[PDB]
Amino acid sequence: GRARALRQFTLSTGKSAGRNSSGRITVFHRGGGSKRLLRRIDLKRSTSSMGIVESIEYDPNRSSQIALVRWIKGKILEPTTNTISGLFSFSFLPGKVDKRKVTKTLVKDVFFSAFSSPKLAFASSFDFPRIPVAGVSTAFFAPRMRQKVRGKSTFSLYEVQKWRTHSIKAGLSWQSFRRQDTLGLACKVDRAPVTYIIASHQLEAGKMVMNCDWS
Amino acid sequence: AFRGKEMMKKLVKKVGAENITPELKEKLKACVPDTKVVMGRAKRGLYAGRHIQYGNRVSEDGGNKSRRCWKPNVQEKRLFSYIFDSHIKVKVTTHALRCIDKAGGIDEYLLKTPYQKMDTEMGLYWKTKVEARYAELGQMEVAFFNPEDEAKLEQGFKDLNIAKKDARREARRTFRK
Amino acid sequence: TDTRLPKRRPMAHPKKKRFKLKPPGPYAYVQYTPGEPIASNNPNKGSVKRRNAKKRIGQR
Amino acid sequence: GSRLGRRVVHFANLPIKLLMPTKLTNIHEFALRTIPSATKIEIKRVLESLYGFEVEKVNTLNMDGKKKKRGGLLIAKADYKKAYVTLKNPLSISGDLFPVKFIEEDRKSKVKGKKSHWLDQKERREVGGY
Amino acid sequence: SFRRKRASSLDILSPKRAPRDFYKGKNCKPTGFHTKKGGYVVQPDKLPNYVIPDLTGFKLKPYVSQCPIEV
Amino acid sequence: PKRTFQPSTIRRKRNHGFFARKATKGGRRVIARRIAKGRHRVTA
RNA sequence: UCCAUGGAUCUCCGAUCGGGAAACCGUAUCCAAGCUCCGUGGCUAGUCUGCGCUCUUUGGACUUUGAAAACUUAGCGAACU
RNA sequence: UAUUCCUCAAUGACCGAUAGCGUACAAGUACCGUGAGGGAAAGGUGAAAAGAACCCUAUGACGGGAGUGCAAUAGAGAACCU
RNA sequence: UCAGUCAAUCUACGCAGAGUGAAUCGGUCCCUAAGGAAACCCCGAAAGGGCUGCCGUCCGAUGGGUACACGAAAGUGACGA
Ligand SMILES: [K+]
Ligand SMILES: [K+]
Ligand SMILES: [Mg+2]
Ligand SMILES: [Mg+2]
Ligand SMILES: [Mg+2]
Ligand SMILES: [Mg+2]
Ligand SMILES: [Mg+2]
Ligand SMILES: [Mg+2]
Ligand SMILES: [Mg+2]
Ligand SMILES: [Mg+2]
Ligand SMILES: [Mg+2]
Ligand SMILES: [Mg+2]
Ligand SMILES: [Mg+2]
Ligand SMILES: [Mg+2]
Ligand SMILES: [Mg+2]
Ligand SMILES: [Mg+2]
Ligand SMILES: [Mg+2]
Ligand SMILES: [Mg+2]
Ligand SMILES: [Mg+2]
Ligand SMILES: [Mg+2]
Ligand SMILES: [Mg+2]
Ligand SMILES: [Mg+2]
Ligand SMILES: [Mg+2]
Ligand SMILES: [Mg+2]
Ligand SMILES: [Mg+2]
Ligand SMILES: [Mg+2]
Numbered sequence: 039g040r041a042r043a044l045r046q047f048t049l050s051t052g053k054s055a056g057r058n059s060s061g062r063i064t065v066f067h068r069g070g071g072s073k074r075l076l077r078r079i080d081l082k083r084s085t086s087s088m089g090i091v092e093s094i095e096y097d098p099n100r101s102s103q104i105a106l107v108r109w110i111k112g113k114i115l116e117p118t119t120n121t122i123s124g125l126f127s128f129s130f131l132p133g134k135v136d137k138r139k140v141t142k143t144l145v146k147d148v149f150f151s152a153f154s155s156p157k158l159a160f161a162s163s164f165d166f167p168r169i170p171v172a173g174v175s176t177a178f179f180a181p182r183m184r185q186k187v188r189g190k191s192t193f194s195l196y197e198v199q200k201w202r203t204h205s206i207k208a209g210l211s212w213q214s215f216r217r218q219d220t221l222g223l224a225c226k227v228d229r230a231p232v233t234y235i236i237a238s239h240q241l242e243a244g245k246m247v248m249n250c251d252w253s
Numbered sequence: 254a255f256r257g258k259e260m261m262k263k264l265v266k267k268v269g270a271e272n273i274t275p276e277l278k279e280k281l282k283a284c285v286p287d288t289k290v291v292m293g294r295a296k297r298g299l300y301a302g303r304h305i306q307y308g309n310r311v312s313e314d315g316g317n318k319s320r321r322c323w324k325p326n327v328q329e330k331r332l333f334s335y336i337f338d339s340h341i342k343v344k345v346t347t348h349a350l351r352c353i354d355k356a357g358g359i360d361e362y363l364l365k366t367p368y369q370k371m372d373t374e375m376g377l378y379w380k381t382k383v384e385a386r387y388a389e390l391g392q393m394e395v396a397f398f399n400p401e402d403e404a405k406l407e408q409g410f411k412d413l414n415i416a417k418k419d420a421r422r423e424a425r426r427t428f429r430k
Numbered sequence: 431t432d433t434r435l436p437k438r439r440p441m442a443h444p445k446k447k448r449f450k451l452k453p454p455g456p457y458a459y460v461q462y463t464p465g466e467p468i469a470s471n472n473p474n475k476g477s478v479k480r481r482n483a484k485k486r487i488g489q490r
Numbered sequence: 491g492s493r494l495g496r497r498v499v500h501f502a503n504l505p506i507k508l509l510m511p512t513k514l515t516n517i518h519e520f521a522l523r524t525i526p527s528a529t530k531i532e533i534k535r536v537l538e539s540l541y542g543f544e545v546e547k548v549n550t551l552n553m554d555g556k557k558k559k560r561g562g563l564l565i566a567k568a569d570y571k572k573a574y575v576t577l578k579n580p581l582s583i584s585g586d587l588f589p590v591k592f593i594e595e596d597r598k599s600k601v602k603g604k605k606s607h608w609l610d611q612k613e614r615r616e617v618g619g620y
Numbered sequence: 621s622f623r624r625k626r627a628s629s630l631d632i633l634s635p636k637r638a639p640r641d642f643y644k645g646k647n648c649k650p651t652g653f654h655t656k657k658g659g660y661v662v663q664p665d666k667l668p669n670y671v672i673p674d675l676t677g678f679k680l681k682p683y684v685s686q687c688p689i690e691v
Numbered sequence: 692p693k694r695t696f697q698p699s700t701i702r703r704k705r706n707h708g709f710f711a712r713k714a715t716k717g718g719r720r721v722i723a724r725r726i727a728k729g730r731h732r733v734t735a
Numbered sequence: 736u737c738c739a740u741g742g743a744u745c746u747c748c749g750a751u752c753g754g755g756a757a758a759c760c761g762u763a764u765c766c767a768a769g770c771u772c773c774g775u776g777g778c779u780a781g782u783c784u785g786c787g788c789u790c791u792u793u794g795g796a797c798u799u800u801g802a803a804a805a806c807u808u809a810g811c812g813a814a815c816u
Numbered sequence: 817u818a819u820u821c822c823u824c825a826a827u828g829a830c831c832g833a834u835a836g837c838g839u840a841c842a843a844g845u846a847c848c849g850u851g852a853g854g855g856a857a858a859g860g861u862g863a864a865a866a867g868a869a870c871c872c873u874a875u876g877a878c879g880g881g882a883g884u885g886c887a888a889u890a891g892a893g894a895a896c897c898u
Numbered sequence: 899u900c901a902g903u904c905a906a907u908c909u910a911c912g913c914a915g916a917g918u919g920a921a922u923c924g925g926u927c928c929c930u931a932a933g934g935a936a937a938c939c940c941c942g943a944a945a946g947g948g949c950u951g952c953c954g955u956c957c958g959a960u961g962g963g964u965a966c967a968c969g970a971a972a973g974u975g976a977c978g979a
Contacts (some may be wrong), residue, residue, distance in 0.1 A: 039978065044470045046458035052932070059948075073978080082455045092468060109457070110468070117405040119398060127394040133364055135266045143272065145280055149368075149381045152267045157796080159389060169335045170395060179395045179404055193396070195409050209331060209340040213297045213375060214939080223938095231460035241417065254809040266800090291810055292943055305943055307811070320812085322943075437661050438967040439653045440928085442753095442761090444955075446970095453971055461973080477974050482962070489923095492790055493773065496763085497668045521919090526646045531667055539670040549919040552646070554636065558622070562846050564630075565622045600915095616940055619919035627845080628731035633756065635925090643926055645761055647695055647746085653761095654927040657964040663964090698849060704756040707851060711748090713757085714935090716945075721852065727804090729844050734757075735851075 044106065047078040047234055058086060074098050080233045087112040089247040094237050105237035108123065108230045116195035127184060128170060156220060173212055175201065257287035260374065284368035286377075296373055298344030300325060301352055331358040336386045360387075504528060505538050510593050514583045516613050519576045526552060526571045533573055549574040549619055576617060707735035 055069030077097050088111040097104045129135060139147075160181075161168055171179050178200045180193050217223055225231075235247070261282065265273070273281070290296060292305055303325035310321040326347045331340040335358060344352070356362040365382045371377050398406070461472055492498075509521040524533065530548040537543045555567035585591060635644050652662040705711060711720030712734055725733045 042470045042976090043469070044458070044460065045974085046460065046974085050931090082456070085456070108462075108468070114416075117402070117409045119402045119405070121399055121402060122396040123399050124397050125394055126397070128390050132391040133361075139394060143274070143277055144413075145277075145284055145368075146381075146384065148264075148268060148273070148277070148281060149284075150385060152264050153378045159386070160393070164337055164339075167336050167338045167390070170390075170393075174397075175377050178398050178403055180398075181393055181395050184392050184394045191396075195406065195413070198398075198406055207339040208424065209342055210334075210337065212299070212341060212379070214344045216375070216378060217938085225459055227464070229459040229463055230468070231457035231459055232468065233456050233458070254807095289809070292940065293946090307943070436663075436966080440656055440659075440967070448970085450953085451970065471976080472973060473975090474973055477976090479975070479977090481964095484928075491772075493788090495669050496665055496789095498671065499668050500671050502670055502672070527648050529648050529651070531651060535668060535670055537667045551919055552636075553918080557625065561625055563842075564625050564627045566625050572917095572919085573667060620923095624842085626731060631732060631735075632758075633700070633704070638756085641925055642700075642756070645758095645926090647759080650761080651971065655965080656928045658925095658927050660919075660927085661966080698850095701756070703850080709757045710755070713749095718854095724852090730847075 043075070043077055043095065044232070044234075049078060050171065051076050072098075077104065077234060080235055083249050085112060085249060086251040087249045089233075089249075091237075091241060091243050091247060092232070092246045093243060094241070103237045104234050105241060106232055107235055108232045118195075119193050119198075120191045122191055126170075142175075159215040160176060164198070168205070171201075176203070254289070256290065257282070260285045286368075286372050288372050290372060294327075294344070297375065298327065299349050299376070300327070300344075300346050300372070301349035302370075302372060303346045303348055319330045334358075335360050336383065336390065399406050502536055502540070504532065506533075506536070510590070511583070514585060514590070516580045517577070517582060518580055518615055518617055519574055522573050522575065523570050524573060526569050528571055528573075530573075533575070537575060543575070544578040546576045546578050563578075574619065580613070703735060709734040 053069070056063050056065035058064045071075075076099060087109045089107040089109045092106045092108055094103055094105050138194065166181055168175075170181070171177070178198050180198050182189065182197075241247075263283065264281070288302070292306065297305065305325065306323040308321060308323070311318050311319045327344055328347065328350075329342070329344050330350070331342050332345075332353065333339075336339050341359060343359075353359055353362045356365050360383055363380045364387065366380070368377060368380065371380055460468055462468065505524060507523040509523065511517055511520055528550075530550060532549075534545045534548050537545055550571055550573045553570055553572060555569045557564065558564045583590065591609075633642065633644075640679050649666075651666050652660055654660055711721055722733060
C-alpha cells in the first residue's frame with residue numbers, strides 16, 4: 039500500500055452480503071467484493087475549533103473523499119424554636135391502625151423475609167414524601183418519629199425543612215427494581231489532535247477550516 | 254396449573270420449612286395466588302387478570318372457520334406513587350388502569366388488593382414493599398410553625414446559604430491560587 | 431543460599447483491552463514533528479514481524 | 491508433621507515391573523512397566539528412595555492394552571506405561587538368578603532363523619531415544 | 621488378565637486415534653503451571669516427598685511360618 | 692467419483708457429539724429416546 | 736467357604752466450583768473465634784508479653800435441587816377418512 | 817375413583833423354537849445409515865464324558881478294525897435324539 | 899481351518915510374544931477472525947426469539963506468539979495485486 043490510513047481511525051468490519059441476523063438473504067445481488075477497512079469520520083463537528091488541512095485521501099466505503107485535519111485551537115447560633123402551632127400524626131395513611139413490632143410469626147413477616155435483602159428508610163434514596171404535607175405546602179415542617187413519652191420541642195435549623203417553590207425526580211421500573219434493590223449486584227510539543235472530515239470541493243492542503251458555535 | 258404449589262415451594266425454600274408452624278402453612282396457602290397465567294409477558298406487568306384468548310374467525314357467507322386470537326389492551330405507562338414520590342413504569346391493561354382510578358392510585362390499589370389477587374410474584378413483592386413503607390410512615394408526625402418562626406428560619410437559611418456560597422468561592426479561588 | 435526468586439503464576443482475572451483505555455471524543459493525539467507530514471505508523475526498534483514465517487522458511 | 495510439605499507420602503504403592511534386558515553386563519539403562527497415572531518425577535523419586543538407584547533421566551511412553559474382537563465379543567487387557575531409566579554408573583545381573591538362564595535359552599531358540607587401533611574404547615555408553 | 625468389555629467402548633475418542641490437536645490426558649497430578657509462552661514452570665512444593673525408613677536389619681518377613689507348633 | 696461421506700472427526704463431534712446434542716431441546720429428546728430404547732452408543 | 740448385624744477403604748462421566756470434542760483440564764473459598772508444635776522482636780529478665788502461617792475444632796457468608804413410564808390438571812391444536 | 821416405572825404370591829380348554837417379547841442362545845448385539853433411525857440369525861450326544869488307548873493306509877484320521885456304552889451313523893467342537 | 903479370483907509350504911490370514919523414549923519436532927498454554935453461547939435488557943399462547951454494545955463475560959484456527967507477576971492517554975504487532 040502507498041498510503042496506509044491512520045491507525046487511530048481504522049476499524050475492521052466484515053461483509054454481510056445481504057444476510058440478516060437469521061442468515062437468510064434479505065438484500066439480493068450482493069457479495070464477493072474486495073476487502074475493505076472502515077474509517078472513522080467526524081460527522082458531528084460540534085466542537086468549535088480551527089484547523090489546517092493536511093491531506094486529502096481515498097475512502098472506499100463512500101463515494102466522496104475525506105480530509106485529515108490537524109487542529110490548532112481547542113458555626114452560628116441557629117434559630118432554635120420551641121413553639122409549635124400544631125401536631126399532625128400520620129396514623130390513618132396505612133389504612134388499618136395496628137401496633138408496632140420490635141412473638142408469633144405472621145404472614146406479613148414471612149413476606150418481608152421472603153422478599154427482603156440478601157443480608158429510618160425515609161431518607162437517602164427517596165426522602166420525605168410530599169404528600170404528608172399537602173394541606174399547606176409553603177410551610178416549614180419538622181418530621182419526627184412518634185414517641186411513647188411526650189417529646190421535646192427544641193428544633194434546630196438543620197431539623198426544619200421546606201420544599202421551596204422549585205418542587206411543586208427519577209423513575210423506578212416495575213420488573214427491574216428488585217435487582218437494584220439487591221445491592222445493585224494544549225498537549226506537549228510532539229502531539230497534535232487530528233480528525234477525519236468529509237472533504238468539500240476546492241479544499242486542498244494548507245487551507246483553513248472553521249467550526250463555529252452559537253452566539 | 255398448580256401455580257400456587259409451585260410458588261409455595263419457592264417461598265418455603267427461601268424462608269426455611271422449620272420456620273413455619275402448621276397454622277402458618279394453612280394461612281400461607283390462602284395468600285399465594287392460584288390463578289391461571291400462562292403467557293410470559295403477563296408475569297412481568299400489571300394485567301389485573303386479563304389473558305389472551307384463542308378462538309375462531311368465521312366467514313359471513315361460507316361459514317368457514319380459521320383460528321385467531323384476542324389480546325388484552327396492554328399499554329406502557331408511568332404511574333405516580335405517593336410514598337416513593339416518583340413515577341413507576343409499568344405495562345398495564347386499561348382494565349387495570351380503570352381499577353387504579355377507582356382505588357385512588359397505584360399505591361392505594363396495592364394496599365387494597367389482597368395477596369391472592371396480585372396474580373404475580375412481582376405483584377406480591379410490590380405490595381409487600383408498599384405495605385412496609387406505609388407502616389414506616391404510620392409512626393411519624395410533623396410539627397408546623399408560627400409565621401414569626403417562619404420569618405426567623407427563613408432569615409437563618411438565607412444566612413447559611415450566603416455564608417456557604419462565600420466559603421465555597423473562597424476555597425475555589427485559594428485552590429486556584 | 432540462593433537469593434534468587436522463583437517465577438510467579440499468571441493471574442486469571444480479566445484484563446482491559448487498549449481500545450477501551452483510549453480517551454473518548456473525536457480527537458486523536460498523534461506523534462508530530464512540526465515540519466514533517468504525519469505518518470500513519472511509527473515502528474520503533476522493538477517492532478519485529480513474521481517470526482513464524484521465518485521459522486517455516488528455515489525448516490524448509 | 492504437616493508443616494514439612496503439602497504432598498508427603500508415607501505408604502507408597504506404585505507398582506514397578508522390570509523388563510529383562512538383552513545383555514547381562516554393562517547395563518546403562520533399563521525398562522519397566524507401571525500404571526498410566528505415573529509421572530517421571532514420581533518414578534524417579536520412588537526408584538531413588540526405595541531401591542537406592544542413581545537415576546539420571548526417566549523417559550516414558552503410553553501403550554494400549556491388547557485386544558481381541560470376534561464380532562461383537564470384545565476382550566481386552568489394561569493399559570500400561572513403559573519407562574526407560576538411565577543410570578549414572580553401569581550395573582550388572584548375575585546368571586545364576588531364576589529365570590535369567592531360561593529367558594536367554596528360550597530367546598536364542600527364536601533367533602536361529604580383530605583390527606583394534608590406538609586409543610580405541612571398549613565399553614562405550616549405549617543409550618537410545620532422543 | 622483378559623476381561624470382557626463392550627464393543628461400543630472403541631468409539632470413545634482417545635488422542636492416539638484423533639486429530640493432532642486433541643488432548644485428553646491420563647489423570648496425572650500436576651506439578652506446576654503453564655506459562656504464557658507455551659512452556660511450563662515446575663513448582664517444587666507440589667512434588668511428592670517419600671518417607672521410606674531404613675529397612676536394613678529388620679527381622680520381620682513377608683510371610684508367616686506355618687510349621688506345626690500347637691493347637 | 693467423489694462420494695458423499697468425507698470423514699472429519701472434529702465435524703463429527705461438533706454435529707453429533709454429546710455436548711452438541713445436550714445443547715438443544717431436540718437433541719435432549721434424542722438422548723432420552725436412545726437411553727429408553729437401550730442403545731449401547733447413546734451419542735456419536 | 737458361607738450367613739446376620741455393624742464397621743474401614745470407597746477412581747470418573749452424567750452433574751451442579753470454572754472450561755469442555757461426555758468419561759478430560761484448572762482449582763489452598765472466606766472470616767471471626769481458641770488450642771499443642773513452629774520463628775522472630777523486645778524488656779528494668781522472670782510461671783514477662785506481642786506478631787505471624789499451616790493444620791485442627793465450632794459456628795456463619797455464596798450457592799447445588801435433580802431427574803423418572805403411565806395416571807392428573809392446564810396451554811396450543813391437525814389432516815387423511 | 818384412575819394408572820403401573822415397581823415388589824410379592826397364584827392361575828391359564830395361552831404359545832411351544834418360521835410359534836411366544838425384536839431377544840429360550842452374552843440382543844437393541846452383529847450389521848445398514850452422515851444423522852435421527854432401521855434391525856437379525858442361532859435350542860437338544862449320552863443316565864454318567866465313560867469324548868474312541870492301540871494297530872493299518874494317507875501330508876494329515878473325520879477312514880477300516882479294536883475298545884467304552886443299552887445303542888457309535890448316538891462320534892460333536894456354539895454341534896452328535898428322531 | 900477361513901480369506902487371496904490356487905492344489906499355496908507364502909501373506910495385509912489364525913495362534914503367541916514384542917515394539918512407539920523429546921525443555922527445542924507436532925500439540926497443551928497465551929491471543930484473537932468468521933461463528934457460537936451466558937449474563938443484563940427487549941419481545942413473545944408455552945417451548946422460545948433478539949441483543950454481545952454505550953461500563954461487560956466464556957469459547958472458537960485454517961492465523962499471530964516461545965525462559966516471571968501487576969499497571970498503561972507511550973510506540974507497535976500490521977498485512978493488496
Ligand atoms: K377436512
Ligand atoms: K440311536
Ligand atoms: Mg513422550
Ligand atoms: Mg468392566
Ligand atoms: Mg496414532
Ligand atoms: Mg482428572
Ligand atoms: Mg463439572
Ligand atoms: Mg412427576
Ligand atoms: Mg423367534
Ligand atoms: Mg423342531
Ligand atoms: Mg431353524
Ligand atoms: Mg456408525
Ligand atoms: Mg479320534
Ligand atoms: Mg432319549
Ligand atoms: Mg485357499
Ligand atoms: Mg494343503
Ligand atoms: Mg508363514
Ligand atoms: Mg498376522
Ligand atoms: Mg513446541
Ligand atoms: Mg465475536
Ligand atoms: Mg449469538
Ligand atoms: Mg436466550
Ligand atoms: Mg458457556
Ligand atoms: Mg480464549
Ligand atoms: Mg494453527
Ligand atoms: Mg498476516
